[PDB]
């Protein structure tokens, strides 16, 4: 019943997913799409921002293009944007995501990670690493990214949690949306009067009169949606991967270059997103061996692409010591993950700190079943009991 691109077995793409061709037509459930699994063909699809569109459309209706109405729920979602509109928004947001600016967040990330590790120690072992650490680190970090006032963060995160809660429907969902929107209206008004030092403040100081309040409010929701599940998934899965490959933990207790090498290897090997935004062909183009017809959709399996032998040899193995390779876990092209550096940093800090606090960290029950996080937009672990 579940679609083929969502299928996993342990840390790996499922055999069924691995058996599919480089580029074939599949049926979801009922929709019909192209599934691209090869590294080459995924890069060809993702590097093409002029013959493919990512803008969600309704009824089938103009495919790509400029100045089409966009529903509230998608304003400020860069992934739903085509150039030239994508190009505008990305350029406005880019200056907040450099290596230099993201490097400045290091002390705060260390603080957040330390506060969470403290909770674990206070709770005592055995402890659930997911609930106390993995699910708890990303929110505050994204707050800092945005420049949500330090003292507003607890209420901000709860309002946000309810709004992005897929389990809610009807009035409870609508009210969660209304409430969060109430805070973000206040936040944008605060920023319009005295621009802060995070992302929202940066944008109003430089481009104030040309950017809208809706856009700034949308940017806030969409950053939270883009940067939470992926990080919590990586922390959970990455810890399990390292614990089950204990010899490779030593790469997180050496110098920074080696811990950076371990992080990007874990990102490739675990590949938490199942797929980037579906692409719709605007005009006919050849991808790999096949003609993809206008109006047809393409879905890229990022995990399989990151197991392609053309990317690296011994690709189904975890090896933290190796040089970084041009994997597609963050995607490729103009939509290439805007938070890439932040993700890399966040994760490096969290892994390093965890083993610094708990050198002899172990699985509470290594012979028990693993509760994987299923039916979400990002693979992960929902519960992971640990001792120290
Ligand atoms: C390891 C964790 C992460 C992974 C694996 C990941 C992966 C990806 C991928 C594959 C895309 C491409 C989507 C597409 O082309 O359709 C993307 C886009 C994006 N990511 Fe991430 N991401 C991660 C963490 C983050 C974080 C921490 C942020 C910060 C908020 C973030 C913000 C974004 C944004 C804003 C985009 C849209 C960029 C655009 O469309 O131009 N991501 N990410």
PDB file of N, CA, C and O in Angstrom, residues 185-217:
ATOM      1  N   UNK A 185       2.155  37.937  13.330  1.00  0.00           N
ATOM      2  CA  UNK A 185       1.725  39.289  12.980  1.00  0.00           C
ATOM      3  C   UNK A 185       2.398  40.299  13.910  1.00  0.00           C
ATOM      4  O   UNK A 185       2.923  41.320  13.460  1.00  0.00           O
ATOM      5  N   UNK A 186       2.383  39.993  15.205  1.00  0.00           N
ATOM      6  CA  UNK A 186       3.068  40.797  16.210  1.00  0.00           C
ATOM      7  C   UNK A 186       4.577  40.827  15.951  1.00  0.00           C
ATOM      8  O   UNK A 186       5.205  41.884  16.021  1.00  0.00           O
ATOM      9  N   UNK A 187       5.144  39.667  15.640  1.00  0.00           N
ATOM     10  CA  UNK A 187       6.578  39.558  15.402  1.00  0.00           C
ATOM     11  C   UNK A 187       7.034  40.399  14.215  1.00  0.00           C
ATOM     12  O   UNK A 187       8.074  41.052  14.286  1.00  0.00           O
ATOM     13  N   UNK A 188       6.257  40.378  13.132  1.00  0.00           N
ATOM     14  CA  UNK A 188       6.590  41.152  11.943  1.00  0.00           C
ATOM     15  C   UNK A 188       6.455  42.650  12.210  1.00  0.00           C
ATOM     16  O   UNK A 188       7.280  43.439  11.745  1.00  0.00           O
ATOM     17  N   UNK A 189       5.432  43.036  12.969  1.00  0.00           N
ATOM     18  CA  UNK A 189       5.251  44.442  13.354  1.00  0.00           C
ATOM     19  C   UNK A 189       6.407  44.940  14.221  1.00  0.00           C
ATOM     20  O   UNK A 189       6.899  46.047  14.018  1.00  0.00           O
ATOM     21  N   UNK A 190       6.847  44.116  15.172  1.00  0.00           N
ATOM     22  CA  UNK A 190       8.037  44.423  15.976  1.00  0.00           C
ATOM     23  C   UNK A 190       9.258  44.647  15.086  1.00  0.00           C
ATOM     24  O   UNK A 190      10.029  45.585  15.305  1.00  0.00           O
ATOM     25  N   UNK A 191       9.425  43.784  14.086  1.00  0.00           N
ATOM     26  CA  UNK A 191      10.583  43.837  13.192  1.00  0.00           C
ATOM     27  C   UNK A 191      10.558  45.043  12.257  1.00  0.00           C
ATOM     28  O   UNK A 191      11.606  45.585  11.918  1.00  0.00           O
ATOM     29  N   UNK A 192       9.361  45.453  11.843  1.00  0.00           N
ATOM     30  CA  UNK A 192       9.194  46.637  10.999  1.00  0.00           C
ATOM     31  C   UNK A 192       9.561  47.929  11.721  1.00  0.00           C
ATOM     32  O   UNK A 192       9.912  48.917  11.080  1.00  0.00           O
ATOM     33  N   UNK A 193       9.458  47.931  13.047  1.00  0.00           N
ATOM     34  CA  UNK A 193       9.775  49.127  13.827  1.00  0.00           C
ATOM     35  C   UNK A 193      11.233  49.136  14.282  1.00  0.00           C
ATOM     36  O   UNK A 193      11.902  50.170  14.199  1.00  0.00           O
ATOM     37  N   UNK A 194      11.721  47.989  14.748  1.00  0.00           N
ATOM     38  CA  UNK A 194      13.140  47.839  15.058  1.00  0.00           C
ATOM     39  C   UNK A 194      13.684  46.477  14.610  1.00  0.00           C
ATOM     40  O   UNK A 194      13.623  45.497  15.358  1.00  0.00           O
ATOM     41  N   UNK A 195      14.209  46.419  13.374  1.00  0.00           N
ATOM     42  CA  UNK A 195      14.755  45.205  12.777  1.00  0.00           C
ATOM     43  C   UNK A 195      15.759  44.530  13.699  1.00  0.00           C
ATOM     44  O   UNK A 195      16.643  45.191  14.244  1.00  0.00           O
ATOM     45  N   UNK A 196      15.594  43.225  13.881  1.00  0.00           N
ATOM     46  CA  UNK A 196      16.479  42.434  14.726  1.00  0.00           C
ATOM     47  C   UNK A 196      17.677  41.911  13.958  1.00  0.00           C
ATOM     48  O   UNK A 196      17.925  42.309  12.816  1.00  0.00           O
ATOM     49  N   UNK A 197      18.415  41.001  14.586  1.00  0.00           N
ATOM     50  CA  UNK A 197      19.667  40.497  14.019  1.00  0.00           C
ATOM     51  C   UNK A 197      19.574  39.064  13.454  1.00  0.00           C
ATOM     52  O   UNK A 197      20.598  38.456  13.125  1.00  0.00           O
ATOM     53  N   UNK A 198      18.353  38.542  13.336  1.00  0.00           N
ATOM     54  CA  UNK A 198      18.116  37.262  12.679  1.00  0.00           C
ATOM     55  C   UNK A 198      17.682  37.443  11.236  1.00  0.00           C
ATOM     56  O   UNK A 198      17.939  38.478  10.623  1.00  0.00           O
ATOM     57  N   UNK A 199      17.004  36.437  10.695  1.00  0.00           N
ATOM     58  CA  UNK A 199      16.665  36.428   9.280  1.00  0.00           C
ATOM     59  C   UNK A 199      15.612  37.470   8.903  1.00  0.00           C
ATOM     60  O   UNK A 199      15.784  38.212   7.933  1.00  0.00           O
ATOM     61  N   UNK A 200      14.524  37.517   9.664  1.00  0.00           N
ATOM     62  CA  UNK A 200      13.454  38.476   9.417  1.00  0.00           C
ATOM     63  C   UNK A 200      13.988  39.914   9.461  1.00  0.00           C
ATOM     64  O   UNK A 200      13.773  40.688   8.524  1.00  0.00           O
ATOM     65  N   UNK A 201      14.705  40.246  10.535  1.00  0.00           N
ATOM     66  CA  UNK A 201      15.324  41.561  10.701  1.00  0.00           C
ATOM     67  C   UNK A 201      16.303  41.936   9.604  1.00  0.00           C
ATOM     68  O   UNK A 201      16.323  43.087   9.158  1.00  0.00           O
ATOM     69  N   UNK A 202      17.115  40.967   9.173  1.00  0.00           N
ATOM     70  CA  UNK A 202      18.049  41.167   8.065  1.00  0.00           C
ATOM     71  C   UNK A 202      17.311  41.592   6.795  1.00  0.00           C
ATOM     72  O   UNK A 202      17.704  42.551   6.130  1.00  0.00           O
ATOM     73  N   UNK A 203      16.226  40.884   6.488  1.00  0.00           N
ATOM     74  CA  UNK A 203      15.455  41.129   5.271  1.00  0.00           C
ATOM     75  C   UNK A 203      14.762  42.498   5.278  1.00  0.00           C
ATOM     76  O   UNK A 203      14.810  43.205   4.272  1.00  0.00           O
ATOM     77  N   UNK A 204      14.145  42.884   6.399  1.00  0.00           N
ATOM     78  CA  UNK A 204      13.456  44.185   6.455  1.00  0.00           C
ATOM     79  C   UNK A 204      14.424  45.373   6.433  1.00  0.00           C
ATOM     80  O   UNK A 204      14.091  46.436   5.918  1.00  0.00           O
ATOM     81  N   UNK A 205      15.625  45.181   6.970  1.00  0.00           N
ATOM     82  CA  UNK A 205      16.637  46.233   6.982  1.00  0.00           C
ATOM     83  C   UNK A 205      17.165  46.503   5.576  1.00  0.00           C
ATOM     84  O   UNK A 205      17.443  47.650   5.219  1.00  0.00           O
ATOM     85  N   UNK A 206      17.290  45.443   4.778  1.00  0.00           N
ATOM     86  CA  UNK A 206      17.850  45.566   3.439  1.00  0.00           C
ATOM     87  C   UNK A 206      16.773  45.786   2.369  1.00  0.00           C
ATOM     88  O   UNK A 206      16.928  46.641   1.502  1.00  0.00           O
ATOM     89  N   UNK A 207      15.676  45.038   2.444  1.00  0.00           N
ATOM     90  CA  UNK A 207      14.661  45.076   1.386  1.00  0.00           C
ATOM     91  C   UNK A 207      13.255  45.449   1.870  1.00  0.00           C
ATOM     92  O   UNK A 207      12.272  45.234   1.152  1.00  0.00           O
ATOM     93  N   UNK A 208      13.176  46.026   3.070  1.00  0.00           N
ATOM     94  CA  UNK A 208      11.908  46.309   3.754  1.00  0.00           C
ATOM     95  C   UNK A 208      10.704  46.681   2.906  1.00  0.00           C
ATOM     96  O   UNK A 208       9.699  45.970   2.896  1.00  0.00           O
ATOM     97  N   UNK A 209      10.812  47.789   2.180  1.00  0.00           N
ATOM     98  CA  UNK A 209       9.682  48.331   1.412  1.00  0.00           C
ATOM     99  C   UNK A 209       9.279  47.504   0.175  1.00  0.00           C
ATOM    100  O   UNK A 209       8.225  47.751  -0.421  1.00  0.00           O
ATOM    101  N   UNK A 210      10.098  46.521  -0.192  1.00  0.00           N
ATOM    102  CA  UNK A 210       9.806  45.666  -1.348  1.00  0.00           C
ATOM    103  C   UNK A 210       9.378  44.230  -0.985  1.00  0.00           C
ATOM    104  O   UNK A 210       8.963  43.465  -1.857  1.00  0.00           O
ATOM    105  N   UNK A 211       9.477  43.874   0.291  1.00  0.00           N
ATOM    106  CA  UNK A 211       9.000  42.576   0.775  1.00  0.00           C
ATOM    107  C   UNK A 211       7.714  42.752   1.594  1.00  0.00           C
ATOM    108  O   UNK A 211       7.558  43.746   2.308  1.00  0.00           O
ATOM    109  N   UNK A 212       6.791  41.799   1.477  1.00  0.00           N
ATOM    110  CA  UNK A 212       5.490  41.901   2.152  1.00  0.00           C
ATOM    111  C   UNK A 212       5.504  41.226   3.522  1.00  0.00           C
ATOM    112  O   UNK A 212       6.364  40.385   3.800  1.00  0.00           O
ATOM    113  N   UNK A 213       4.546  41.607   4.365  1.00  0.00           N
ATOM    114  CA  UNK A 213       4.349  40.985   5.674  1.00  0.00           C
ATOM    115  C   UNK A 213       3.945  39.514   5.536  1.00  0.00           C
ATOM    116  O   UNK A 213       4.452  38.669   6.279  1.00  0.00           O
ATOM    117  N   UNK A 214       3.059  39.215   4.580  1.00  0.00           N
ATOM    118  CA  UNK A 214       2.652  37.829   4.290  1.00  0.00           C
ATOM    119  C   UNK A 214       3.874  36.975   4.006  1.00  0.00           C
ATOM    120  O   UNK A 214       3.983  35.858   4.501  1.00  0.00           O
ATOM    121  N   UNK A 215       4.785  37.513   3.202  1.00  0.00           N
ATOM    122  CA  UNK A 215       5.990  36.794   2.827  1.00  0.00           C
ATOM    123  C   UNK A 215       6.886  36.527   4.022  1.00  0.00           C
ATOM    124  O   UNK A 215       7.376  35.415   4.191  1.00  0.00           O
ATOM    125  N   UNK A 216       7.068  37.542   4.862  1.00  0.00           N
ATOM    126  CA  UNK A 216       7.850  37.384   6.076  1.00  0.00           C
ATOM    127  C   UNK A 216       7.214  36.387   7.044  1.00  0.00           C
ATOM    128  O   UNK A 216       7.931  35.613   7.680  1.00  0.00           O
ATOM    129  N   UNK A 217       5.882  36.400   7.150  1.00  0.00           N
ATOM    130  CA  UNK A 217       5.176  35.446   8.014  1.00  0.00           C
ATOM    131  C   UNK A 217       5.288  34.038   7.440  1.00  0.00           C
ATOM    132  O   UNK A 217       5.489  33.081   8.178  1.00  0.00           O
TER     133      UNK A 217
END
